[PDB]
């Protein structure tokens, strides 16, 4: 049952992403803002992050589907 499930997401279009931080404690972080007028940039990312290529950051808790130690920052 599990095998079909995973397979479907692989057939493209698919998102590859880049893990910036390995870590697996201290969730929560921040991205994006409101508006009005006066300009200074800001960005963040923690726990484990993946930044997908629409330029969006995501918080996931680890799975054994692939091992996190085998993964890197």
């Amino acid at each position: 049952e599990n095998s079909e499930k995973i397979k479907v997401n692989k057939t493209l279009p698919y998102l590859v992403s880049n893990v910036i931080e390995l870590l697996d404690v201290d969730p929560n972080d921040q991205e994006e803002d409101g508006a009005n007028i006066d300009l200074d940039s800001q960005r963040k990312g923690k726990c484990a992050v993946i930044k997908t290529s629409t330029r969006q950051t995501y918080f996931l808790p680890v799975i054994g589907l692939v091992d996190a130690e085998k993964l890197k920052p």
Partner: peptide, 10 residues
Amino acid sequence: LPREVDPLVY
């Protein structure tokens, strides 16, 4: 969760 910056090993 309490605000600290994220640590850097990258």
